[PDB]
Design an enzyme around this catalytic site. Structure first.
Site, PDB file in Angstrom:
ATOM      1  N   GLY B  30      -7.981  43.206 -13.083  1.00  0.00           N
ATOM      2  CA  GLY B  30      -8.307  41.901 -13.614  1.00  0.00           C
ATOM      3  C   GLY B  30      -7.359  41.367 -14.665  1.00  0.00           C
ATOM      4  CB  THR B  31      -7.394  37.995 -16.246  1.00  0.00           C
ATOM      5  OG1 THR B  31      -6.768  37.094 -15.328  1.00  0.00           O
ATOM      6  CG2 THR B  31      -7.212  37.530 -17.681  1.00  0.00           C
ATOM      7  CB  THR B  32      -4.502  40.964 -19.992  1.00  0.00           C
ATOM      8  OG1 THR B  32      -4.537  41.561 -21.296  1.00  0.00           O
ATOM      9  CG2 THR B  32      -3.658  39.718 -20.026  1.00  0.00           C
ATOM     10  CD  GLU B  47      -2.832  36.950 -17.528  1.00  0.00           C
ATOM     11  OE1 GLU B  47      -2.105  36.763 -16.523  1.00  0.00           O
ATOM     12  OE2 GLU B  47      -2.961  38.071 -18.072  1.00  0.00           O
TER      13      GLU B  47
END
Lengths: 243, 244, 198, 250, 241, 233, 244, 242, 111
Positions: B30-32, B47
């Site tokens: 996943g996104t950070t 993000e």
């Protein structure tokens, strides 16, 4: 057939692999702890390890204040440990409400052991990968140490140790008692009992400790409390001025 | 034998719960997102990958508030994230209803902790596919927390999860050593905007949108609020500047 | 209430039941048969609350016919009366009790003897030579106490009933529009179509 | 959530065996030996207190449990399973008997209750059988003294004497040689100690052995006086000292 | 609590548990029913795996649902009891609410619905039973014969058979039953029924039971002799050639 | 691999995937194409209705949820009915209890949450349908894309279904253009039909084959089918 | 999920047989043999005790013969614990009937009910069947002396003589060989002992390995009496019949 | 094993697809909609000469303005018919009017996906999908005559003509060429009779095949054997005519 | 003790013309001897060319009208926007009212 290893039913050898593998999980944290009884107190020592620099050291603990008089140290993953702590606290509070007196250390231990026995017999419930050590200065029994495991087993101890290097701590303690011929640390102050506890922790593991490498819980008449980094430091200094 | 990784609450021979570990994979994919604890509050940032020009800018908000003083952001399966916050909100409302006082962050954390831990006890459910960074301000200070799919959580000085967690942790660890006295809410915001820009390299292929929120005793009155307008652009620049 | 009388003679049981069905100010029917055959040799008469009366009777009828089919056997009159007493004994402590009183007249083909059972809505059961529910007993029991004999013939029983009905028609304030009479014996149940002037 | 294991975990195999029961019995076999002997005026049950560590306080763990004031139990197999079974047995003795008749259940009936509980774990949905075998010794006015064995299947049988666990085969053989219908309680205790000695590897004293009897009424263990009909419990656990005294006459 | 779907579809569109329920029926003793012009006869065969039974008390194969309707079956005996009881209960309920006994088709449709339901309800297996339901509608003289199977499907037959070797006896009936002139007599109808059974019973005077149903609740079961007599007269029809 | 981890939605694969959910998503791709786009005054839904035979009808792909909201579906029709019905109730609840029209963004959150439950519990199955939600609320025109995974996204325009990628690239190109088509519905629709025709291949949108829906400023969500869409073919 | 561990105890084999019932019967075939013989003046129930020891308390023992009513009794072949469950509910059904109709329950009614309970475990619930087979010996005023049998499937039948458990094939052939309609209780008692004596898998047939019972209508009374022989009583009848 | 509501890798529900297979094995059923009414015909397909053909009911009345034909595991259709009849009657009780054919169909189709062992959405207590498809035909003031195909998938399509069952692919191809917007009821009747004759294993006659229709004026009617026998004779003549 | 009912006064009138119909009502809302409002609409347009008024206890009257309007809305949803005819609305209202047969909407309604 090969599922006698996934849920808690007997294997052809009459074994419960899930309970065994649960015991394996107790060492996942690679932490060792030990407990000893003083003349009128009960001390519990446990290694503290904070690897990540991004962690708030103050929030990393495996010791819990179950009730005003009972302390519990857990050997095993933190989520299962917190699950066990919450249940024990609720149990302790309910017992007081229904029976009019504080739940004794051994009774709470039996109760948690029985719950564990259940996960051992009912398929939909998994065992908790933890070993629980309960301590207090019982109003009837005096200093007490009672430990329970994923098998639903529990018993009282003169002293005990748990974790990866459990055996070394145990033999060390065994030896000391074969020598002393008594079943407790004949010291009047808990501070000295804490020092004894840490001293043997060191001898057995062959390691030195800083104030942030340990965690300490103490149980006295009507109260169980944990020590601070500074209370511990004062302990480490004292033992230093002897070696 | 094998097959220990097909059912959720099963202990493998080495004492592990593979399904929880696989959930973690969903998180790392996943996104950070991160969180930075400051001298009187906490800052959250994440993000937001811009799949295309069609995504309305600033609209698909990810950070979520619980009650009025807690901020929550997560990486992994977004829907699992919302699910966990819904529970958090009920957990918070129930606490306030009985005790009057809004729920302390430590208490709130264990509520989320116990609930997530509960999803690793049966094979009739699946573990949560997200790691969550949340926190806020209460009776005695600010608190930052991160909760894993195993139900494990701890208090943090700084925290990050997702695709670029390493870059972030690296950046966060720097700040910790270089600021033993404590960062300020204003500073933490900018610092956050940067850590995210940096950590975005592990996904430099797609364009993104920055999102920040904070809860500071002096800057927001202890209430969680989103960083918007000028203050937002100011941090965006502070980042765009130090990215070169 | 309505008239519900029963008399057990030497080889049969006779049940007399009033034909009127009154609702308030008007007599709606004057040919009502307040009885249900539970089995070939068991008849039940009933009186009580407006709707409960038939609903209960038919419910019992249904249960006994079901037992007959399942077992291909006819329960003894004693067994049937015990079943009925228990139903009423449950009913009295239920939300809305059945306000129904009954007389069960049956011919026990195994013992070869007639039997009369009186049971009220509380589940109070008793076995008698003759019985009644309501005020009926008040006017007729002195007559039955006097003329009753265990060896009476069906014919003598009918004459004794006729005497009771005449006393009822003279002293009772309500016009119950006569009674329908039925005989139960070793050959089953039959109705005395001629009592309007027997 | 919600236990969705509503189907049996114990079922018949093509051979007619109920695997889980067999395996449970296997667990019992690995258990520490325990035994019981019926005398003319008492019954004795004993077992070894296999301390799992010298730091453990063996007293804080009783393998011999009082169920009613005239009935006691001992076992072989999984201690945790036994512990909960004792809690349930003590409770059913009340809910299903004392609260109804105002008196404690006779040994055979309580045994029957326990047995039922065990049978159910052999068929109810989502559970495994209990991995234990119990030996219940008791006394009741109309049946006198009795001794029963209850297995994981829920089956139970009365004995004059018997043993279960590890060295049951040997122990049973040794009991058949020394048992007769004229043994006095002390004789049975003595025989119990001798039988148990063959099964013990290490130390054999009043601290490593646990023993209880169902004998005469102990008016001294009642706790009160004033009611002629209440004379005291027949169940009595022997003390470490009482055991040693008898070990010298071994 | 238990609600596992035991009856589900397989790739080829079959419900194996219902299919296997039929296999249980093929294994059961044979049952046949033929309708005359003024009656319906129901014949069943009696196993012989073990003989030393008490015919008085051992449950018979033909069961009365009400005084004007009977039911016979092939398959699991234990299973049939459940359907018989439900049918009997329904028969009384119908009389209680409609004030009229059930028609044969109604009773059949009921039993069939219960069977169908057990094919798509969780936690239960289908009935390993097929039935023959015969009788006369209240105040009607036209004979009725229906058949039901595990799937819940049902229909009426001039004559039909179920159970082991029913393939054989059905053929017999297909080339021995004329819809133009149905057995105009209770006697010639009972004969055709015994003939069809002898095609598979292999000499079994005590292995063959008949039950005759006539209009207005006139139902009766024949005795060994009465039947044995039919057998005797039939073996001669053969030898006399 | 996959085969061992796709027997139900309560199982993660070794890489952190949820196959049952993914397979559900596959039902959408198999579904007929539908497009959604908005200006600052209106939101439009253009959907290609698919027919079974030439003797069959062209299944409806647009459902009105309230006077100010509606959606288009691609995939299992039944699931769309269940989900839109739920949306209708939520819109209704908002009106009856708070005398407030439901925010399109709120509806999206509700759908995400309802779908999520069917991906973490044993016994259930994920929804096998995609949805495009358009509406006009207190913040103007809105377009939402709903996926069975529970992921809901707000966009200026988009498309789902077979060959949807065609219309999508077109809209991602035409963006700056249509987003300014304010005050003129006919233009917005025409732009919608131009994006959808970019996903054709088989045939060409006919009269009983095209379906259009619009909502906006002074226009309650209304659906046009047949003759009513003739002036756009 | 849980489905993975479900044995599916209630399904058909491709041949239309019920797995569990068949396997339960297999289980029963290893159980001590039990015999039932009905005479003109009574019924005899005899069973062989499976496994015994010198120390087993036979005076207080009962594992095969149980009193259900004052007019009905059963001989058990299979899992004793399972049997007791069924026996207890049967004892209750009898009393329910008595309280409802004020008449002792006809033998078949009671047998059918118990068989119906068994049949249930065969069609729904997902539980294993009871590993038990019963021989019912009773008396009522509609059919007089009756002998029935029920097994795991829930099917039951009536007999003049019958056996359950081990070696029923052999035992049945012997019974069919010497049974006679006009037999008398004493004849039946002897036939039963002889039959067991020939089918025993043990050395000799002693009293300590037997349970014996009779349901007779003691001429000098007029009522029915059940007699469950005592150890010494069995030992006697054993010498008399010429088996010593 | 594997859940009853599991998705295949291609995005299809196994139990539903397998359900469709059972329906292919079913008897043929055909429906034709015209501006003069809708015709519904079916193949009786008795399994033995001793089976009384008229006890085969594959065409049933839902309400006076709605009729329906089935194909597949017909025993499975009883509860569907029941639900349908209740729905139509209930609608009339609540609104004092006839239920629209489409609404009635949508209601029946709502039962379709209600199966599983515990699907998180309500209480779908049905172990498997229905193994039968239905052709619902009727008339209502708003959309005139209508023909619907209701499948175990919960989806229902409207058709001008449709065939289901064993001979469907063939029969459908036929309907493709024969159907036109101006067919008369009589033409539809013969047309259905003809297609059934082509796909049926047996020689179509008034005993192994059955016709029915629904018209605004007389509602739903099942043609009695004699009426159909004549139409069959009329079909043979027009065929032998060229 | 708590009384779940009240009386808000008011009067309503409905007259059907050959090709038209009217539904009138005063706009005064009261409680005992006090006026709550001199203008509180009591006759509503429920769509589909149907006007309705439930006079008596206002809380009950509002709940009913509100329930019926929502009923028209779903009628459209469930029957392809078919128009709800006045007779169908009437039958529908009967069921709404009878549903509370044992805790009635204390109103006299006219459409």
């Amino acid at each position: 057939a090969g599922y006698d290893r996934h849920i808690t039913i007997f294997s052809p050898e009459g074994r419960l692999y899930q309970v065994e593998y649960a015991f394996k999980a107790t060492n996942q944290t690679n932490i060792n702890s030990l407990a000893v009884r003083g003349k009128d107190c009960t001390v519990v020592i446990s290694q503290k390890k904070v690897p990540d620099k991004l962690l708030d050291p103050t929030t990393v603990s495996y010791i819990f204040c179950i009730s005003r008089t009972i302390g519990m140290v857990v050997n095993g993953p933190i989520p299962d440990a917190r699950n066990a702590a919450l249940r024990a606290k609720a149990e302790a509070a309910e017992f007081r409400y229904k029976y009019g007196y504080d739940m004794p250390c051994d009774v709470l231990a039996k109760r948690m052991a029985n719950l564990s026995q259940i996960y051992t017999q009912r398929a939909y419930m998994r065992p908790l990968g933890v070993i629980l050590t309960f301590v207090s200065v019982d109003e009837e029994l005096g200093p007490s140490i009672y430990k329970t495991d994923p098998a639903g087993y529990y018993v009282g101890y003169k002293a005990t140790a748990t974790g990866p290097k459990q055996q070394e701590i145990t033999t060390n303690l065994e030896n000391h008692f074969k020598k002393s011929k008594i079943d407790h640390i004949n010291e009047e102050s808990w501070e000295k009992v804490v020092e004894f506890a840490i001293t043997h922790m060191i001898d057995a593991l062959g390691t030195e400790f800083s104030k942030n490498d340990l965690e300490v819980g103490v149980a006295t008449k009507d109260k169980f409390f944990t020590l601070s980094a500074e209370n511990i430091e004062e302990r480490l200094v004292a033992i230093a001025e002897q070696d | 034998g094998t097959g220990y990784d097909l059912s959720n609450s099963v202990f493998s021979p080495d004492g592990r719960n593979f399904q929880v570990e696989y959930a973690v994979k969903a998180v790392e994919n996943g996104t950070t997102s991160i969180g930075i604890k400051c001298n009187d509050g906490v800052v959250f940032a994440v993000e937001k990958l811009i799949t295309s020009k069609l995504l309305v800018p600033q609209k698909n908000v990810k950070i979520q508030v619980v009650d009025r003083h807690i901020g929550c952001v997560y990486s992994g399966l977004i829907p699992d994230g919302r699910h966990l916050v819904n529970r958090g909100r009920e957990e918070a409302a129930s606490f306030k209803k009985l005790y009057k006082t809004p729920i302390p962050i430590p208490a709130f954390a264990d509520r989320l902790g116990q609930y997530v831990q509960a999803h690793t006890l049966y094979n009739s459910v699946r573990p949560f596919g997200v790691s969550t960074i949340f926190g806020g301000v209460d009776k005695n200070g600010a608190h930052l927390y991160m909760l894993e799919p195993s139900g494990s959580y701890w208090g943090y000085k700084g925290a990050a999860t997702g695709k670029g967690r390493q870059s972030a942790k690296a950046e966060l660890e720097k700040l910790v050593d270089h600021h033993p006295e404590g960062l300020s809410a204003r500073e933490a915001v900018k610092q956050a905007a940067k850590i995210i820009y940096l950590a975005h390299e592990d996904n430099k292929e797609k364009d993104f949108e920055l999102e920040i929120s904070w809860c500071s005793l002096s800057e927001t009155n202890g209430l969680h609020k989103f960083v918007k307008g000028d203050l937002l652009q100011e941090a965006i620049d502070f980042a765009q500047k130090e990215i070169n | 209430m309505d008239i519900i009388l029963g008399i057990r003679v030497q080889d049969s049981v006779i049940l007399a039941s009033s034909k009127a069905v009154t609702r308030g100010i008007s007599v709606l029917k004057d040919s009502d048969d307040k009885t249900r055959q539970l089995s070939p040799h068991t008849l039940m008469s009933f009186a009580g609350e407006a709707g409960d009366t038939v609903q209960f009777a038919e419910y019992i009828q249904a249960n006994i016919q079901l037992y007959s089919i399942r077992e291909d056997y006819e329960l003894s009159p004693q067994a049937v009366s015990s079943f009925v007493r228990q139903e009423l004994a449950k009913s009295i402590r239920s939300r809305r009790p059945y306000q129904v009183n009954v007389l069960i007249g049956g011919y026990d083909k195994k013992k070869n003897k007639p039997e009369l059972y009186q049971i009220d809505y509380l589940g109070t059961k008793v076995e008698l030579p003759y019985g009644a529910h309501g005020y009926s007993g008040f006017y007729t029991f002195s007559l039955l106490d006097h003329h009753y004999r265990p060896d009476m013939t069906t014919e003598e029983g009918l004459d004794l009933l006729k005497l009771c009905v005449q006393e009822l028609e003279k002293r009772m304030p309500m016009d119950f529009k006569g009674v329908i009479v039925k005989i139960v014996d070793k050959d089953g149940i039959r109705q005395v179509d001629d009592f309007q002037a027997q | 959530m919600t236990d969705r294991y509503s189907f049996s975990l114990t079922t018949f195999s093509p051979s007619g065996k109920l695997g889980q029961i067999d395996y449970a019995l296997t667990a019992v076999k690995q258990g520490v030996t325990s035994l019981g002997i019926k005398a003319t005026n008492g019954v004795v049950i004993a077992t070894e207190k296999k301390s799992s560590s010298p730091l453990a306080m063996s007293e804080t763990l009783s393998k011999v449990s009082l169920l009613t004031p005239d009935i006691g139990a001992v076992y072989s197999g999984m201690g945790p399973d036994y512990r909960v079974l004792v809690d349930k047995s003590r409770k059913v003795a009340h809910t299903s008997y004392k609260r109804i008749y105002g008196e404690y259940p006779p040994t055979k009936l309580l045994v029957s209750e326990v047995a039922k509980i065990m049978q159910e774990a052999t068929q109810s949905g989502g559970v495994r059988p209990f991995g234990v075998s119990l030996l219940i010794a008791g006394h009741d006015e109309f049946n006198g003294f009795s001794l029963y064995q209850v297995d994981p299947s829920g089956s139970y049988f009365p004995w004059k004497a018997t043993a279960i666990g590890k060295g049951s085969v040997a122990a049973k053989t040794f009991l058949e040689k020394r048992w007769n219908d004229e043994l006095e309680l002390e004789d049975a205790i003595h025989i119990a100690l001798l039988t148990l000695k063959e099964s013990v590897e290490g130390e054999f004293n009043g601290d490593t052995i646990e023993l209880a009897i169902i004998g005469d009424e102990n008016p001294d263990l009642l706790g009160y006086t004033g009611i002629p009909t209440d004379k005291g419990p027949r169940f009595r656990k022997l003390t470490s000292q009482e055991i040693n005294d008898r070990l010298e006459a071994l | 609590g238990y609600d596992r779907a035991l009856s589900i579809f397989s790739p080829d569109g079959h419900i194996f548990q219902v299919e296997y329920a039929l296999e249980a029926v093929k294994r059961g003793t044979c049952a046949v029913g033929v309708k005359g012009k003024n009656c319906v006869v129901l014949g069943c065969e009696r196993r012989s795996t073990l003989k030393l039974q008490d015919t008085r008390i051992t449950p018979s194969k033909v069961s009365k649902i009400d005084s004007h309707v009977v039911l016979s079956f092939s398959g699991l005996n234990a299973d049939s009891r459940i359907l018989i009881e439900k049918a009997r209960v329904e028969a009384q309920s119908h009389r209680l609410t409609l004030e009229d006994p059930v028609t044969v088709e109604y009773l059949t449709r009921y039993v069939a619905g219960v069977q169908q339901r057990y094919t798509q309800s969780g936690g239960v297996r289908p009935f390993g039973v097929s039935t023959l339901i015969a009788g006369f509608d209240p105040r009607d003289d036209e004979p009725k014969l229906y058949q039901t199977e595990p799937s819940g499907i049902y229909s009426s037959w001039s004559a039909q058979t179920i159970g082991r070797n029913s393939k054989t006896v059905r053929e017999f009936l297909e080339k021995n039953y004329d819809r133009k002139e149905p057995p105009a007599t209770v006697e010639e109808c009972v004969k055709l029924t015994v003939r069809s059974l002898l095609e598979v019973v292999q000499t079994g005077a005590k292995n063959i039971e008949i039950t005759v149903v006539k209009p207005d609740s006139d139902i009766v079961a024949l005795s060994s002799e009465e039947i044995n007599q039919y057998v005797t007269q039939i073996e001669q029809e053969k030898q006399e050639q | 691999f996959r085969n061992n981890y796709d027997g139900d939605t309560v199982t993660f694969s070794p890489t952190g995937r949820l196959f049952q959910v993914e397979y559900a998503l596959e039902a959408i791709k198999q579904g007929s194409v539908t497009v959604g786009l908005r200006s600052n005054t209106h939101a439009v839904l253009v959907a290609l209705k698919r027919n079974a035979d030439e003797l069959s009808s062209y299944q409806k792909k647009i459902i009105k949820c309230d006077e100010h909201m509606g959606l288009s579906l691609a995939g299992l029709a039944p699931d769309a009915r269940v989900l839109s019905n739920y949306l209708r109730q939520q819109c209704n609840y908002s009106s009856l209890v708070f005398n407030r029209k439901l925010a399109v963004e709120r509806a999206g959150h509700l759908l995400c949450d309802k779908a999520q439950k069917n991906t973490q519990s044993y016994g259930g199955r994920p929804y096998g349908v995609g949805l495009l939600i358009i509406g006009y609320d207190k913040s103007g025109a809105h377009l939402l894309e709903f996926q069975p995974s529970g992921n809901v996204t707000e966009l200026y325009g988009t498309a789902i279904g077979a060959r949807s990628q065609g219309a999508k690239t077109y809209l991602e190109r035409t963006l700056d253009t249509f987003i300014k088509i304010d005050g003129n519905p006919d233009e917005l629709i025409k732009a919608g039909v131009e994006a959808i025709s970019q996903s054709l291949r088989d045939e060409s949108l006919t009269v009983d084959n095209l379906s259009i829906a619009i909502v906006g400023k002074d226009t309650p969500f209304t659906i046009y089918d047949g003759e009513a869409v003739a002036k756009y073919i | 999920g849980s489905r993975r561990y479900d044995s599916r105890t209630t399904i058909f084999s491709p041949e239309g047989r019920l797995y569990q019932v068949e396997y339960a019967l297999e289980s029963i075939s290893h159980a001590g043999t039990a015999i039932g013989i009905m005479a003109s003046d009574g019924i005899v129930l005899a069973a062989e005790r499976k496994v015994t020891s010198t120390l087993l308390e036979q005076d207080t023992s009962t594992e095969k013969l149980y009193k259900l009513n004052d007019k009905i009794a059963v001989a058990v072949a299979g899992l004793t614990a399972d049997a007791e469950i069924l026996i207890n509910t049967a004892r209750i059904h009898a009393q329910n009937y008595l309280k409802t109709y004020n008449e002792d329950i006809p033998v078949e009614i009671l047998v059918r009910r118990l068989s119906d309970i068994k049949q249930g475990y065969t069609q729904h619930g997902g539980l294993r069947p009871f590993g038990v087979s019963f021989i019912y010996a009773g008396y009522d005023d509609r059919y007089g002396y009756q002998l029935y049998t029920s097994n795991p499937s829930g099917n039951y039948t009536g007999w003049k003589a019958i056996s359950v458990g081990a070696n029923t094939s052999a035992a049945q052939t012997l019974l069919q060989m010497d049974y006679k309609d006009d037999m008398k209780v004493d004849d039946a008692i002897e036939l039963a002992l002889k039959t067991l004596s020939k089918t025993t898998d043990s050395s000799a047939l002693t009293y300590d390995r037997l349970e014996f019972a009779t349901i007779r209508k003691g001429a000098n009374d007029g009522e029915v009496y059940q007699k469950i022989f005592k150890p010494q009583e069995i030992k006697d009848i054993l010498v008399k019949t010429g088996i010593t | 094993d594997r859940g009853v509501s599991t998705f295949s890798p291609e995005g299809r529900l196994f139990q539903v697809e397998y359900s469709l297979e059972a329906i292919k094995l079913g008897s043929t059923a055909i429906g034709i909609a015209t501006k003069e009414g809708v015709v519904l015909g079916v193949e009786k397909r008795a399994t033995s000469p001793l089976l009384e053909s008229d006890s085969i009911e594959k065409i049933v009345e839902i309400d006076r303005h709605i009729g329906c034909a089935m194909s597949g595991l017909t025993a499975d259709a009883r509860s569907m018919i029941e639900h349908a009849r209740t729905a139509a009657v209930t609608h009339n009780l609540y609104y004092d009017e006839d239920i629209n054919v489409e609404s009635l169909t949508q209601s029946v189709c709502d039962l379709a996906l209600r199966f599983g062992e515990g699907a998180s959405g309500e209480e779908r207590l049905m172990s498997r999908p229905f193994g039968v498809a239905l052709l619902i035909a009727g008339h209502d003031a708003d959309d005139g005559y209508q023909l619907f195909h209701a499948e175990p998938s919960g989806t229902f399509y409207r058709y001008n003509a449709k065939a289901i069952g064993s001979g469907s692919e063939g029969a459908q191809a036929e309907l493709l060429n024969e159907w036109h917007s101006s067919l008369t009821l009589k033409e539809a009747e013969l047309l259905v009779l003809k297609i059934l004759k082509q796909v049926m294993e047996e020689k179509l006659d008034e005993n192994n095949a059955q016709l029915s229709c629904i018209t605004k004026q007389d509602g739903f009617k099942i043609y009695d054997n004699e009426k159909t026998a004549e139409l069959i004779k009329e079909l043979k003549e027009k065929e032998a005519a060229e | 003790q708590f009384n779940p009912y009240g009386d808000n006064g008011g009067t309503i009138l409905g007259i059907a013309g050959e090709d038209f119909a009217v539904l009138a009502g005063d706009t005064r809302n009261i409680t005992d001897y006090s006026i709550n409002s001199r203008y509180e609409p009591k006759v509503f347009d429920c769509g589909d060319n149907i006007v309705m008024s439930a006079n008596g206890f206002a809380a009950d009257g509002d709940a009913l009208v509100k329930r019926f309007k929502n009923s028209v809305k779903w009628y459209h949803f469930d029957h392809n926007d078919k128009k709800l005819s006045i007779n169908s609305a009437a039958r529908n209202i009967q069921h709404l009212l009878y549903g509370k047969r044992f805790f009635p909407y204390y109103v006299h309604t006219i459409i």
